[PDB]
Design a protein around this nucleic acid. Structure first.
Ligand SMILES: [Zn+2]
Ligand SMILES: [Zn+2]
Ligand SMILES: [Zn+2]
Ligand SMILES: [Zn+2]
Lengths: 81, 814, 62, 62, 814, 81
RNA sequence: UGCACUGCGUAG
RNA sequence: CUACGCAGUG
RNA sequence: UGCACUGCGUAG
RNA sequence: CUACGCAGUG
């Protein structure tokens, strides 16, 4: 009505790309375990998962068994569905 | 046995412990326990917590359970009681209503309300005309204010129908104005608080009104969603092209503020660039689980991790020291200072410490009296607004901040802006709020602890405006000698002795104390920072109007208190605290230290029994303190003067921006008339939300030895020219580490080493008079190394290795 | 003394490791930094020697 | 144990030093061989660590 | 009190201590002290040394003063007495002359001559026709022989007019024949030694005559210049071109020997190449101060220094062992075996140990009886000369030596020479002496000590000729079971138990002893090596004549005893000792060990009082031993048989080339009838010129425990198939070091590791039955590592990690 | 007279070049301190002095002060005068 | 790669 | 006094 | 980069 | 039995 909106909400409802930083595998399963997840009342489908060294970590490699071999934190980039 | 009572009468007054269905404990007991906290005596607090299912006895078996930093889970335990407190508040209102319906006039005290919220007092109640009852709730509410935030009483307000079980309220994401909600909360909880409350501080009559309204807003803001707060932005058309520009700000303390010159040049370009609106709008959404802080957006496709390189090692100096007999086995002097390398997650981890900043509501009457007293410590200084041509900048080659760091240094922007442009920007800041982005940078320096240290580089515009606003007062403070604040006073040429003599001035039974502030820069309450800003700005009575001063305060809050933080390509919202890169960092912290000391003294004096006090003057002083605190609105200048004189006589303070050396009377402190270390611990507990350990605090019984530590320097009494003087010396380990380890290899060897070692020798000369022989030998080692470096490089230079040059530096001739 | 020169050796080893672009790998840098910081803060000579040996082995591996 | 792995580290350091053509210099080779032999025959852990540090410094110098 | 006496009569005989102007001490006392040496009881020797100014009492304060290796300066102290001894000898001759002039027949004993040389005995002297007196000096001279070389009595003979003060005699550098000087020395010193003395052993009647003449030549050669000895060479014309070729040899023991086929083909080419004459003639003069040994020449423009590389480390096996619980703190099993690197001066330094070889003159009668007894230990074996086609060479890819190593390996030369050519070379060696050059090579092997080890690679021609000469006897010895020499007897399949049972055979009160030879290969006297060579060659009675056998002995001496040594491009003259690369290295050392044991037994029996002996048989045996030793020339076969039977009954020996395990009677050893450790120490002192420490010697009281150590293996008694057997096990540290450390990286990993670890497991299996648990766990660790290696590489291979395969190896089935 | 001579004496009286190995400086001053020395009843004048590393050590460098800096042993080659 | 204070060194 | 560089303090 | 002894593994 | 390789012992 007034035309004024908080700045913080602009990226939330208008950002096409989402980047999530994962410190450990526990937060990984909690937040974005699958290829598609829900955040900020929106559905995001994953496009890429890189490590701290900027290497392309695949979805299959992410697991409890192979977690010690990953350069955490993991940066996961997804696009709005 | 002893129960807490808040008493007022002709004979005695104060809030203290006295020897004097219903529950075992009252609300006064809880308030006293949470406001006078001593780990040695926590029986009442433990019993209250256990009885009401806040926690179990086993919780107390764990050590450091009370500490917030070591055991943050304690915050949860206290929260378990908050709901109960909330209920009491509601009941209180009901009681007041009944009195108003019964024509009853009386004073409500915390000690007459049980922890179940029931009021069982019918004394001091005098019948009057029905409907005309006016209860007094100043003491009750004012004393209970600190507990409300610590226990998070109003958490239920975040749920539908104010029920914890039912889901949370889903506010509109675009909503940012909660004025009606603030009025509704104030009416439901603080219905009979006669003083007018302004949710928006724009409509505050004066600085005290601003403090009152901000104190209430701190409590009221915890209910509202975090996303609502922050800069307010609009989409506008400029030059036939669309831009998103900030046109307002929502402050958790000051409410909603709208820019007065909103419309739809170099000044405008900098205003737009510094504004985080464009950066956030063009930035991708970010979710960072590495911290509990709010995440705004990401300006970079990939996250950035910064590491701290290891220190360089000077083999020549270490080998020379080893050859001369240092660094032996069992030697007292050892290397304990190093450059500690850090991983890529260090910087963000440091930012995570901002989690220790919590919403804190202060005792408004106590804060008002304390600020009035503190203003006396800054009466000698003069301040005001100055023009651009009167501004002095020490270094023009420093960083201009984000995004200004991309294009050049501060020199570029200072040269680009003419004096007229800078004045126009300053006047604009007097009418509008300019949010800015502050970068967090790891600092590369010596330390004896592995923790990384961060500094906040603020934007160029904020630095320029704050300089024009405050530099006059800041320079006035730095040029004053013999005052409580000792910024600008050199320790050389007898300055240390002069300062120490000033501190000891006219104390009947002097002892010395010194304390520490755990996580000072991070855990500082926002209210105290606002109070310090108001104290600094009170020098602008003539050159600025009420609106101008309020807008300057809002700009400072939006650029210092809750600005936007840039960390590794990501934007975050600072919960609170103080930034280290501010134009007033040292002086605001000095004001905070003085305020904490005055609060501790006030708490100590009121906590005393009063009847036991055998001095009529002190008893009258305590009675008048209570009167001016919880019974009188207008500032009593005479009593403020008297209390300031009392503190100066019995409480002599030397403050440098974090570090305090206090000379205090023996008997008065023993009898509770003057604050002790325990009073400071309690104040830091219920105000600063941090636990102060006695290990980091020191007390010196004898004045001859001097302060244990001040600015990392210890004191010795030495004989110079038939006169005994106080001389500061540093820890030998620090100097040796500085000599051995260097920032970069550029300063590893060459002529530049001569200046570094000359400065180190200047600092370390006082170790010659120390009884320990190795401490003295450190200075001779430094001199011999300077000799060897000069020989390797190869008349005036003789003075460098002759000790007369360093002798002259510590004599009172200059 | 052995403790002080062990600390100095650890510092110089970390410096040369950093100059070897070891910081490109996140986990290896984290391990080296942790070992070096522990060596500096270590109060027992044997533990300092063990950590110095570990860091020297890290360097020798490449 | 630290003594055994210190001995193994000394052996491998001497091997790599020999592969670095250190034996071309007579005195440096003599010093390295003496240090390594003392490390192997050493019965005190602290002396073994000191000699290992010395040999590692020899390697680091080049 | 007790004084040394040499007594002979019907009642008692022997040289022992008895309770029975003139000096306090006699020559017999000195001989007894220097021939029966015990560090615990050296009072007589110390008093004799101090009284005659040989040294001071403070010399005895220093420990290990007696030891030659630790304190070589002792050799000087003894030398201070030599002149005195020399004087005595001269006086003795005078005395004899007087008797011959007085017609007096009597026996001269060492105990009747004082240390001043005067003879004070006039008993047992019977008047006869004047000029017909014939004194008996067999016992006197024979007992005094060992002292002469130790004290260097004849040193004065190297000075003009036989005066130490006056300068040395300057002999012609080209002179090499000293036959007249040898006759003159023998006539002046041993005038009344009735046995004929041949300075040149070419004219010796038999092996005993050769030993006698060589014993005298050893003493006589010390006078002559060292340069005189060595190969004799001539300049000759061959094919119209001049060549320098060896045509003779001067031996310090055998005198001058001239080749019989001197004249002025492949055989001739090898004879010339192996000859050091050409190499020395074409080599530059060399002076090497790094050693006390003689320097001949340098074949290289620059000196060569060789270094020992460090051992390779197997990280897989060490990590596996660590993971399984080994190499922990305080564990009994530890790594004590390594590859020790060496500097460039190591090899020559090792050669310097040859300084411990000294000219030693033996008691000729004792040596003759001892060799006769020793021959009985080799009677069962058969030997002789074989043809080229009957020679077996284990490895043909070994080094051919210098200069033959330049052109190829031993296979090249064996293929080049046809059987007829090899037979021709062997026949030539039966008529001429072929000097050869032996190279010294550092050996790369595991050890628990930092000392480097050297091996002597001999030339191809010497190896071929010695093989044709000795291989028959050597193979006969290696194929014999149940004999004293246990070369060729496998320890596996119950061989250890069989050997131990053989040693224990028929001992009344058995105890076990084992001893060590300090610097055996370096300090061995030349006379004992010659005796061993003669013992080995005595099997050639039918196939070789006296001249052929003598020339073979001369070739062996010129190629083994005092050959030319090639070290780092430099030629040196070996003072003596034994080379480790000989065709008869192990067997010659076994002969030496048996000879030393027999000498110790003889000394023990004669040193006994005799009167105290309560056994008539033992007393008669001692009397007949003295008779056959110092009174009878011809060998008494019956008494040799009886003494051999006595030793076999009461002294059972198991000898492998350095290592001896002896089962001996309790009571006989206690009473002195059989040799003890002290007797061996004394024998090694006055014969081997080395001190034997009791630490390296072991004595086992109980037979069940078994020998403490034999061939680096310890013994356990274990239960196998209802039968208790003796089982050898190695030190776990050696096996673990072998597993962890490897020679080269080629064998670091792969299939080749399987064989190495299988062999190590075969060796270490006996540790399973050890009471210590870690010792047993070593074998399981090895088996598990074999499993892991097989898994990494990836039915029959199962046997490798199944323990039945290693079980079978130690059962008596095969 | 006989025409037979010991082999060892042939290099002594016929070698034109002499090589001496010096383990330490003490033996250096004892044996061949100067540029010309006497050995085997012959006068030898020095031509070269190398170290264990085959480097050309000069006569001036050889001294007590600089002895620790020399790679002993020293090989000195001289010619018969 | 921050805001202040203090003290040194080199040119004017 | 100004320009540059360095060191210490919060 | 030596002389012997013993025991294993791969082809015949 | 022979050829090759390995391990241990003196
Ligand atoms: Zn207001
Ligand atoms: Zn103003
Ligand atoms: Zn003869
Ligand atoms: Zn024969």
């Amino acid at each position: 009505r007034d035309g004024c909106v908080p700045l913080n909400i602009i990226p939330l409802t208008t950002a096409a790309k989402l980047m999530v930083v994962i410190p450990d595998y526990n937060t990984y399963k909690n937040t974005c375990d699958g290829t598609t997840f829900t955040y900020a009342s929106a559905l995001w489908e994953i496009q890429q998962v890189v490590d701290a060294d900027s290497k392309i970590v695949q979805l299959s490699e992410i697991s409890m068994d192979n977690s010690p071999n990953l350069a955490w934190p993991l940066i996961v980039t997804a696009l709005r569905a | 046995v002893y129960r807490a009572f808040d008493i007022y009468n002709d004979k005695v007054a104060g809030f203290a412990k006295f020897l004097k269905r219903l529950t075992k404990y009252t609300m006064a007991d809880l308030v006293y326990a949470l406001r006078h906290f001593d780990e040695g005596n926590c029986d009442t607090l433990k019993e209250i917590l256990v009885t009401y299912n806040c926690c179990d006895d086993d919780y107390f078996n764990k050590k450091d359970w009370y500490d917030f930093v070591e055991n943050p889970d304690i915050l949860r335990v206290y929260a378990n009681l908050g709901e109960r407190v909330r209920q009491a508040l509601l009941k209180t209102v009901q009681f007041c209503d009944a009195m108003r319906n019964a024509g009853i006039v009386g004073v409500l005290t915390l000690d007459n309300q049980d922890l179940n919220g029931n009021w069982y007092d019918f004394g001091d109640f005098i019948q009057t005309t029905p409907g005309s009852g006016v209860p007094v709730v100043d003491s009750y509410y004012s004393l209970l204010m600190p507990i409300l935030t610590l226990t998070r009483a109003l958490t239920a307000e975040s749920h539908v129908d104010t029920d914890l079980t039912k889901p949370y309220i889903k506010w509109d994401l675009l909503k940012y104005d909660f004025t009606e909600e603030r009025l509704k909360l104030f009416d439901r909880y603080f219905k009979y608080w006669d003083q007018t409350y302004h949710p928006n501080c724009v409509n505050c009559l004066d600085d005290r009104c601003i403090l009152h309204c901000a104190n209430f807003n701190v409590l009221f803001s915890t209910v509202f969603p975090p996303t609502s707060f922050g800069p307010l932005v609009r989409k506008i058309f400029v030059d036939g092209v669309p831009f998103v520009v900030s046109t307002g700000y929502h402050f958790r303390e000051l409410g909603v503020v709208h820019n007065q010159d909103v419309n739809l040049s170099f000044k405008e370009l900098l205003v737009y660039a510094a504004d985080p609106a464009m950066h956030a709008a063009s930035g991708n959404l970010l979710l960072d689980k590495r911290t509990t802080c709010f995440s705004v957006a990401a300006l970079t496709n990939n996250v950035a991790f910064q590491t701290v390189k290891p220190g360089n090692f000077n083999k020549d100096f270490y080998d020379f020291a080893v050859s001369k007999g240092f660094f032996k086995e069992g030697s007292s002097v050892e290397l304990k200072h190093f450059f500690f390398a850090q991983d890529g997650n260090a910087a963000i981890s440091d930012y995570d410490y901002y989690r220790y900043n919590l919403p804190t509501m202060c005792d408004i009457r106590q804060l008002l009296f304390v600020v009035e007293v503190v203003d006396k410590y800054f009466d000698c200084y003069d301040g005001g607004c100055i023009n651009a041509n009167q501004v002095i900048v020490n270094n023009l080659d420093k960083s201009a901040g984000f995004p200004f760091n991309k294009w050049g240094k501060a020199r570029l922007y200072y040269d680009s802006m003419s004096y007229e442009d800078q004045d126009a920007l300053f006047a604009y800041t007097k009418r509008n709020v300019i949010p800015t982005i502050t970068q967090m940078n790891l600092k590369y320096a010596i330390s004896a602890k592995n923790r990384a240290r961060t500094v906040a580089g603020v934007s160029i515009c904020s630095t320029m405006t704050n300089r024009q606003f405050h530099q006059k007062l800041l320079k006035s403070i730095a040029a004053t000698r013999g005052a409580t604040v000792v910024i600008g006073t050199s320790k050389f040429y007898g300055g240390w002795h002069n300062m120490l003599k000033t501190v000891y001035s006219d104390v009947e039974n002097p002892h010395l104390m010194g304390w520490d502030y755990p996580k000072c820069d991070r855990a500082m309450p926002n209210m105290l920072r606002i109070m310090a800003s108001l104290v600094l700005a009170r020098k602008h009575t003539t050159c600025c109007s009420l609106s101008h001063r309020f807008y300057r305060l809002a700009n400072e809050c939006a650029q210092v208190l809750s600005e936007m933080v840039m960390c590794g390509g990501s934007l975050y919202v600072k919960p609170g605290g103080t930034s280290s890169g501010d134009a007033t960092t040292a002086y605001a912290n000095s004001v905070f230290n003085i305020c904490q000391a005055v609060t501790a003294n006030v708490n100590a004096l009121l906590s005393t029994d009063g009847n036991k006090i055998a001095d009529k003057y002190v008893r009258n002083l305590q009675h008048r303190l209570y009167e001016c605190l919880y019974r009188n609105r207008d500032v009593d200048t005479d009593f403020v003067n008297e209390f300031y004189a009392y503190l100066r006589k019995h409480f002599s303070m030397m403050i440098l921006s974090d570090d305090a050396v206090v000379c205090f009377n023996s008997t008065y402190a023993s009898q509770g008339l003057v604050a002790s270390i325990k009073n400071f611990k309690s104040v830091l507990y219920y105000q600063n939300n941090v636990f102060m350990s006695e290990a980091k605090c020191w007390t010196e019984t004898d004045l001859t030895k001097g302060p244990h530590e001040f600015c990392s320097q210890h004191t010795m009494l030495v004989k110079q020219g038939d006169d005994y003087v106080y001389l500061p010396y540093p820890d030998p380990s620090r100097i040796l580490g500085a000599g051995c380890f260097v920032d970069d290899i550029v300063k590893t060897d060459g002529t530049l080493m001569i200046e570094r070692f000359v400065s180190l020798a200047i600092d370390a000369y006082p170790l010659t008079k120390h009884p320990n022989q190795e401490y003295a030998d450190v200075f001779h080692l430094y001199l011999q190394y300077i000799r060897k470096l000069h020989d390797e490089l190869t008349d005036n230079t003789s003075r460098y290795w002759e000790p007369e040059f360093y002798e002259a530096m510590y004599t009172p001739h200059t | 003394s052995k403790m002080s020169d062990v600390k100095c050796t650890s510092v110089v080893l970390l410096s040369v490791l950093q100059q070897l672009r070891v910081e490109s790998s996140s986990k290896l840098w984290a391990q080296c930094v942790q070992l070096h910081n522990d060596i500096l803060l270590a109060k027992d000579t044997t533990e300092a020697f063990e950590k110095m040996v570990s860091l020297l082995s890290v360097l020798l591996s490449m």
